[PDB]
Design a protein around this ligand. Structure first.
Ligand SMILES: [Ca+2]
Ligand SMILES: [Ca+2]
Lengths: 413, 412, 415, 413
């Protein structure tokens, strides 16, 4: 059969060019992913996969703790870091399997679902709640035995997608040995607009150390670089007030991933528009785990203050959070969650997969890597469209009990 | 071929676009129904955004005796799509405009390939020249018979657009608003407001105000304004106040933002005035068609004779989020009416068809799919459009003719 | 051409037997509906149709008042009252047109077919109606009143049973106002209201008893219903007595039926005080469609001390049974035709036809022959094919009359 | 291949419209069911399934206790609560698998499909179940728990009407605990109990009153029901008062619901003393399936003293109405899956799919399109043919999972 269809439904067989109209000279590659994750003491956990991610980020593993909160374990990537060798990329196909491979010195089920939004948009991430994230029967699978395993297959979220910049490093020199410079995924940014205050009235008695408040908290999604811009305007009738403002980017496990000062001892002048601008740039290397929320903290203070003293101000303002390349299909959505429970503590949950890409090499590699437009295959796209339209009749799933996927592979070959 | 049917006869329902943008989606039809009231001049203008990917369908303006237009209201779909969906693509759309009441009149309509503020003439007769395409203009149709606006493609293989849906958020402010906006394909305007511009004037209690510039730009949904102005001065004690105004098609101020407040200028130094503005969609009450910057110069302890002066250089960048997404700002279809009896009702009725992706809550009960495979649908669409002139497929029609066209199609 | 499809799509042509498996000896009849309704001073109104109603009730007309409330005008029925001549019935097909016929261009109509019953609509405004359904072929907007709209009844299931019509039964009584009927009953609709689950009431007295509305709920009824169940009261205060009244409210907010449930029911301390509901509301008492039910309870202590604390705790569930209410077409679906900007005093004209399968009452049976009805081998499959291609064929439940007329021509040519 | 037959025999592949004459505009949905049940200390238990239930109730789990009694564990439902989003429903197809997934080889399963409702079973022991039916294709014995059993729902009539889901209706009340719904009602089941026909009661006084259980009867209820009727009492003795209570008992012997029918009802001599029944038991109050009803009557003599005679004669009938009880699938049939010898603490995993034809509630109707559904000329005939050849084809209601799997292959080819 058509090579692309083969690649699409059976990624582990290798790559093939997407039969669309995005004619770029490129090269084809397969990157494997292999992880042996350890089960925590509740025997429950969650793996978040970004099936359509155009690059080396495959997912993240979280363990569920006794207190009911998740805790970040680690990212799941490809064998090598693509940005080190390539500058542009497009995802061709991908599949990963998750199954237990071990038992601790002398158990378990999986629920999985493919959600059409991004991580922070899920309304329920519990083992059982997941089963309702989507209404599509072929995008959910329940109570599969961990030992048999589940297979996650990436299905398209649009074709004729452009190539994505990989966040490759660029030629640069600096005084700081820690300096970092890259060209990021940017085309198709996602933008969140937050009006944190519209004549919001703040009022409180002085207090040594200042009074702190969290003006707002909002769910947003970010895996790679983002920028935060905009401004808050403050009004006050009180003399001697100074502000300290800090933005926090929170991870899926509730921990603080990034903190940035926005205002430091910003004094407020009476009867005037006090401007507090935001000029934040958060680079990818600082994001240690997926960001799922953003909150603003403001600390109001008065230097020569006394117990009882009045500190008050009114504020108005909007921020814009720009996730570079955030709306590129596959970059933040969709998400495939694989949850496991009742697995013996200390067991090994093994992840193994392949990702196939269309790539454009970086300058150094371009000297030795030939690139081409790729096999003309007249009916490949029509066939793909036919297959996907008949998705329900053919039973092509995004999540499968591995045994069934294997049977499906035979019935295909 | 369902797509062709939906495209040319939107009121029959939606169909998936036969392109290569394969996303699991659902198909929906949203109606638009309005009974607009005719002002005392008997003249008015309806501005339609034929390709708008979402719930905004147009805006109504009445023409006043003084010759200026006055904003009436927005024209939307029956329900607010962003409340139920996160992503969208326009499949097809058509709207009819005709008089339904007597308490007379004609219509001129045209489809302009730019955005609203780019039109050079918006008068009832002037519109007839906005385009050279005979199939994109229609003149003096009787208001009682009506006109039909049909949405024709401005590119396929367009991506799904974020709808400006609300995101989960909690804040101390009850008026707090948080959304994920239409962003892909931003439109960017760059304005160099000053390049060593010399300002000079004699003191004056209260300060001296100048409008540094005024420019035409278009915006319906969120936008941001960044950049900076740099000021130089040899005079001591000067302070600046600067404000940005976003103006509506009717000349009214829609939005004001302080950019500088009592910003004092130091001598022999680069005085920086940054712009960090974000204008959310909920604040835009009517389409924005221009932007202007105001600077007020002042000297606190000054006396007559004192000379106020500074030199400035600087550039701003106005980013209209998702502004260049085809259909978001351009094209525009204008339907103008005149000589209609005052107090009459101009009735608008239409259908909008979309490919949509449900929000998280609705996704729990709404099944999404890739959509019928129809091998020759795109080729047939391309053939029809290339023979557009020979087939007479218009973007604006005298309704009677559109109706005949519908019959001649269902019988072919 | 298959008579049934012809009847279904063009009801005014006459009846035909439903090609299903409900083989009963019956007769076929057509009842017309004709009304000249008057437009109120706001120029806005609403006609509610019960497109699938198995009997003579076609709809109800309401005018919109200056204050924003609707006001009941009258019921729309068939030329004759079917229950007076027949005992059983099945709806075959039905169509109605609504248009302005007089002048004292003066108006628009929005119409929609909702898959629930009247009280379940979330928005009944002229423009809100456009969203009641997502089906593009079950809604129509801003049609000129002079051209008009056509309501076409599409099936909500076949192989439906015959419905009892609410015919009079032989009876004699001392009361001249006595009424006895055999009612539509198969497939009742049942609403269960747990009005209170240890609800705590405590109120200051007030002359005449402190009155509260324990609860209010949306329910639908056009014909007889019964209300059963019981409330159990507990109290530590002596001398309290309760008055309870069930109220059945119309779509216009007016009280349609009121029934005493408790009258001077005294409450004994430290004991389960029982308040049973044994209500039967007969069809002839319902003057307009019911859209809500409320329980008013008046608590009184024997003294009469303005301000005297009153208290009791209550628990209970009531069951509201709408006889035959779940029979498809009896309460759902509903087709609403709203009009606005019509000149005050104009006449909105309604004209239609209802087709039925009927079983005559005893007296008429002596002269009306009944039969099983034409065998037509492919009629049901043809129907199913047509309905499954409903969107492709554009078969609507609401149409701009001009289009429906074109559709009829396009049909009589092929056949 | 007929989608409907595919759905019917292989529910996990998704829904299809029933090819009968109930032509309603509807939508099609699949709801999964996933449960990890824990085995008690006897290593024995019972799962009761309602294979044809038109809605979200799939079944109930009971553990067998050392004393030989069952104990209710929990209900087994679909992933989401259908009555919250839809108002009407029809069951298209359904299948569930039951197998052990953990070990802290242990155990066997016996399963049977009984044509009555739960309380009508004459024997619910692990081995007794094998006789509940004579149909060889509706019973299966000693399947290993590790391999598992598959319950397949087979029709109990077509051309069934849509069922009201017990959805909430718009209502407001003084009580925050107020509940109001439109219940499954078409085709009610009615039990008529003549509790007494001039029954003579006589007993010596006792401080506290004398208690008797006039009668006890097996009835079945899962959702709302009402009890009506009346008892008439006669007596020659002065000063007697009665207390009467109705108790609705669960399958495990526990009291699920209690209602006072008479409280301090005094008896007047030489007159007909009326004791009406006006009970309405809403669904939310039924915590587990009801399998019996009993009436308790406490006779007391106010000014009574030791030695006092107490007596009365009674006559009466009650009518218990189970709303929608006789709708095929609502109470009957029932499929019982029993397991024994399973290691205590093991997990018995349940995983299934339910397919429905539904009508959305008013809010969802604004965004969910409904249709009549694919015309498929021979689907019904093919279904009738298949079912008539049920024995020859070996189409079972309960299967050893391995065989069901083979059956699926033999069908897809
Ligand atoms: Ca393309
Ligand atoms: Ca039948």
């Amino acid at each position: 059969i058509v090579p692309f269809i083969r690649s699409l439904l059976m990624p582990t067989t290798g790559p093939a060019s997407i039969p669309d109209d995005t004619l770029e000279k490129h090269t084809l590659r397969s990157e494997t992913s292999t992880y042996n994750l350890t089960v925590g003491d509740t025997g429950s956990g969650l793996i978040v996969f970004f099936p359509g991610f155009p690059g080396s980020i495959v997912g993240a593993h979280y363990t569920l703790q006794s207190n009911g909160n998740y805790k970040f374990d680690q990212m799941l990537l490809t064998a090598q870091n693509l940005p080190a060798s390539y500058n542009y990329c497009r995802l061709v196909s991908r599949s990963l399997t998750v199954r237990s491979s071990t038992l601790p010195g002398g158990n378990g089920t999986i629920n999985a679902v493919t959600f059409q939004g991004s991580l922070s948009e899920l309304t329920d991430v519990s083992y059982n709640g997941l089963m309702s994230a989507t209404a599509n029967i072929n995008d959910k699978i329940g109570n599969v035995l961990v030992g048999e395993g589940v297979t996650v297959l990436s299905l398209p979220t649009s074709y004729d997608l452009g190539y994505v910049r990989l966040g490759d490093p660029i030629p640069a020199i600096g005084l700081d040995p820690k300096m970092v410079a890259t060209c990021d995924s940017s085309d198709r940014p996602r933008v969140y607009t937050i009006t944190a205050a519209d004549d919001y009235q703040f009022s409180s008695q002085y207090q040594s150390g200042g009074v702190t408040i969290t003006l707002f908290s909002a769910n947003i999604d970010a895996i790679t670089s983002l920028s935060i811009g905009g401004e808050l305007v403050f009004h006050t009738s009180v003399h001697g007030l100074a502000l300290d403002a800090t933005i926090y980017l929170i991870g899926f496990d509730g921990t603080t991933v990034i903190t940035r000062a926005v205002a430091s001892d910003n004094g407020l002048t009476t009867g005037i528009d006090n401007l507090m601008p935001f000029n934040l740039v958060i680079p990818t290397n600082e994001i240690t785990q997926p960001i799922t929320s953003i909150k603003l903290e403001i600390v109001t203070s008065k230097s020569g203050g006394q117990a009882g003293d009045q500190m008050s101000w009114s504020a108005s303002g909007s921020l814009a959070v720009t996730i570079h390349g955030g709306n590129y299909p596959g970059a933040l959505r969709p998400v495939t969650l694989v949850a496991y429970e009742r697995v013996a503590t200390g067991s090994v949950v093994t992840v193994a997969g392949v990702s196939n890409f269309e790539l454009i090499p970086n300058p150094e590699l371009a000297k030795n890597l030939v690139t081409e437009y790729g096999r003309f295959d007249p009916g490949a796209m029509n066939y793909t469209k036919l297959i996907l339209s008949e998705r329900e009749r053919l039973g092509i799933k995004t999540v499968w009990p591995t045994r069934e996927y294997t049977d499906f592979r035979e019935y295909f070959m």
